[PDB]
Design an enzyme around this catalytic site. Structure first.
Site, PDB file in Angstrom:
ATOM      1  N   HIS A   1       0.938  -1.295   0.028  1.00  0.00           N
ATOM      2  CA  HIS A   1       0.005  -0.100  -0.119  1.00  0.00           C
ATOM      3  C   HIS A   1       0.725   1.356   0.077  1.00  0.00           C
ATOM      4  CE1 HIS A   1      -3.686   2.478   1.016  1.00  0.00           C
ATOM      5  NE2 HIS A   1      -2.894   3.171   1.737  1.00  0.00           N
ATOM      6  N   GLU A   2       1.790   1.244   0.917  1.00  0.00           N
ATOM      7  CA  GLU A   2       2.767   2.479   1.035  1.00  0.00           C
ATOM      8  C   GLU A   2       3.545   2.857  -0.032  1.00  0.00           C
ATOM      9  OE1 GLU A   2       0.595   3.362   4.147  1.00  0.00           O
ATOM     10  OE2 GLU A   2       2.044   4.722   3.303  1.00  0.00           O
TER      11      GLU A   2
ATOM     12  N   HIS B   1       1.856   4.356  -2.787  1.00  0.00           N
ATOM     13  CA  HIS B   1       1.747   5.998  -2.524  1.00  0.00           C
ATOM     14  C   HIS B   1       3.450   6.450  -3.114  1.00  0.00           C
ATOM     15  CE1 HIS B   1      -1.944   6.543  -0.669  1.00  0.00           C
ATOM     16  NE2 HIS B   1      -1.523   5.899   0.642  1.00  0.00           N
TER      17      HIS B   1
ATOM     18  N   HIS C   1      -5.398   6.876  -2.767  1.00  0.00           N
ATOM     19  CA  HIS C   1      -6.451   5.970  -2.353  1.00  0.00           C
ATOM     20  C   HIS C   1      -7.463   5.500  -3.717  1.00  0.00           C
ATOM     21  CE1 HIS C   1      -5.420   6.712   1.792  1.00  0.00           C
ATOM     22  NE2 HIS C   1      -4.752   5.877   1.389  1.00  0.00           N
TER      23      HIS C   1
HETATM   24  N1  EEG Z   1      -9.124   1.641  10.112  1.00  0.00           N
HETATM   25  C1  EEG Z   1      -8.666   0.556  10.094  1.00  0.00           C
HETATM   26  O1  EEG Z   1      -9.423  -0.509  10.012  1.00  0.00           O
HETATM   27  C2  EEG Z   1      -7.125   0.225  10.557  1.00  0.00           C
HETATM   28  C3  EEG Z   1      -6.827  -0.461  12.079  1.00  0.00           C
HETATM   29  C4  EEG Z   1      -7.930  -0.162  13.146  1.00  0.00           C
HETATM   30  C5  EEG Z   1      -7.507   0.173  14.541  1.00  0.00           C
HETATM   31  O2  EEG Z   1      -6.560  -0.785  15.177  1.00  0.00           O
HETATM   32  O3  EEG Z   1      -7.668   1.545  15.011  1.00  0.00           O
HETATM   33  N2  EEG Z   1      -6.395   1.345  10.392  1.00  0.00           N
HETATM   34  C6  EEG Z   1      -6.099   1.436   8.890  1.00  0.00           C
HETATM   35  O4  EEG Z   1      -6.818   0.827   8.203  1.00  0.00           O
HETATM   36  C7  EEG Z   1      -5.635   2.968   8.568  1.00  0.00           C
HETATM   37  C8  EEG Z   1      -6.679   4.006   8.438  1.00  0.00           C
HETATM   38  C9  EEG Z   1      -6.543   4.868   9.442  1.00  0.00           C
HETATM   39  C10 EEG Z   1      -7.656   6.238   9.274  1.00  0.00           C
HETATM   40  O5  EEG Z   1      -7.903   6.782   8.060  1.00  0.00           O
HETATM   41  O6  EEG Z   1      -8.269   6.372  10.129  1.00  0.00           O
HETATM   42  N3  EEG Z   1      -4.864   2.938   7.090  1.00  0.00           N
HETATM   43  C11 EEG Z   1      -3.575   3.079   7.228  1.00  0.00           C
HETATM   44  O7  EEG Z   1      -2.939   3.371   7.841  1.00  0.00           O
HETATM   45  C12 EEG Z   1      -2.973   2.983   5.544  1.00  0.00           C
HETATM   46  C13 EEG Z   1      -2.074   1.871   5.211  1.00  0.00           C
HETATM   47  C14 EEG Z   1      -2.881   0.462   4.840  1.00  0.00           C
HETATM   48  C15 EEG Z   1      -3.764   0.660   3.789  1.00  0.00           C
HETATM   49  C16 EEG Z   1      -4.439  -0.590   3.231  1.00  0.00           C
HETATM   50  C17 EEG Z   1      -3.794  -1.888   3.573  1.00  0.00           C
HETATM   51  C18 EEG Z   1      -4.029  -3.310   2.977  1.00  0.00           C
HETATM   52  C19 EEG Z   1      -5.040  -3.486   1.831  1.00  0.00           C
HETATM   53  C20 EEG Z   1      -5.366  -5.314   1.557  1.00  0.00           C
HETATM   54  C21 EEG Z   1      -6.335  -5.777   0.429  1.00  0.00           C
HETATM   55  C22 EEG Z   1      -5.804  -6.573  -0.354  1.00  0.00           C
HETATM   56  C23 EEG Z   1      -6.457  -6.877  -1.360  1.00  0.00           C
HETATM   57  C24 EEG Z   1      -7.645  -6.564  -1.620  1.00  0.00           C
HETATM   58  C25 EEG Z   1      -7.896  -5.277  -1.091  1.00  0.00           C
HETATM   59  C26 EEG Z   1      -7.334  -4.853   0.108  1.00  0.00           C
HETATM   60  C27 EEG Z   1      -4.620  -5.816   2.691  1.00  0.00           C
HETATM   61  S1  EEG Z   1      -3.801  -4.437   3.728  1.00  0.00           S
HETATM   62  C28 EEG Z   1      -2.720  -1.816   4.574  1.00  0.00           C
HETATM   63  C29 EEG Z   1      -2.100  -0.564   5.166  1.00  0.00           C
HETATM   64 ZN    ZN Z   2      -2.974   5.107   2.243  1.00  0.00          ZN
END
Ligand code: EEG
Ligand code: ZN
Ligand code: CA
Ligand code: CA
Ligand code: CA
Ligand code: ZN
Length: 159
Positions: free
Chosen positions: A114-115, A118, A124
């Site tokens: 993902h990173e 970017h 996104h």
């Molecule tokens: N919001 C959540 O669900 C989680 C963790 C929750 C918690 O611990 O607080 N946090 C996050 O998701 C935060 C968001 C923060 C925000 O904007 O609020 N995102 C970030 O930190 C961005 C980094 C990032 C984004 C996406 C992924 C993945 C995409 C997939 C995948 C594979 C196949 C098909 C489709 C997808 C596998 S994993 C991994 C890293």
């Molecule tokens: Zn991102």
């Protein structure tokens, strides 16, 4: 269209290692993540240990020297800057997460895919199937595939 690297040979350097994983596993996760993207573009990535590394990989916590502080465990897992000099391209991982090679904690490989997206200039995606979708979800690493949306995105930037 966001910024793009104006070259197809891109270096990265792992600035530091999370104590969560052994160094070899971090190397492997990052190398494989870059490979995901080079598989569908003309881009080549080489790891160096100093010098003019384009993409610096960093693990840090809280306020860590840029205007994008981390938030402790959970929430923001990582962030990256689009192509550019200095901090441009750099990918930062929140050390307050527990980084793993697997489904426990936060998977480093998936997060780096993902990173790096970017770091290459992708924003996104609103497609829930795309790795560039904003939220983390663990998927079987062995069967992980870039979505057609991701491939569309990256091929629109590099060819
Ligand atoms: N919001 C959540 O669900 C989680 C963790 C929750 C918690 O611990 O607080 N946090 C996050 O998701 C935060 C968001 C923060 C925000 O904007 O609020 N995102 C970030 O930190 C961005 C980094 C990032 C984004 C996406 C992924 C993945 C995409 C997939 C995948 C594979 C196949 C098909 C489709 C997808 C596998 S994993 C991994 C890293
Ligand atoms: Zn991102
Ligand atoms: Ca950089
Ligand atoms: Ca966090
Ligand atoms: Ca950690
Ligand atoms: Zn940062």
């Amino acid at each position: 269209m966001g910024p793009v690297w104006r070259k197809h040979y891109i270096t990265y350097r792992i600035n530091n290692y999370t104590p969560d994983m052994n160094r070899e596993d971090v190397d492997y996760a990052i190398r494989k993540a870059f490979q995901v993207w080079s598989n569908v573009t003309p881009l080549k990535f080489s790891k160096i240990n100093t010098g003019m590394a384009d993409i610096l990989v960093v693990f840090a916590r809280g306020a860590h020297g840029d205007d994008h502080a981390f938030d402790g465990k959970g929430g923001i897992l990582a962030h990256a800057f689009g192509p550019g000099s200095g901090i441009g391209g750099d990918a930062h991982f929140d050390e307050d997460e527990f980084w793993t090679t697997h489904s426990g904690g936060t998977n480093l490989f998936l997060t780096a895919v993902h990173e790096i997206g970017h770091s290459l200039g992708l924003g996104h995606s609103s497609d829930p199937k795309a790795v560039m979708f904003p939220t983390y979800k663990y998927v079987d690493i062995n069967t992980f595939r870039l979505s057609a949306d991701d491939i569309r995105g990256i091929q629109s930037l590099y060819g």
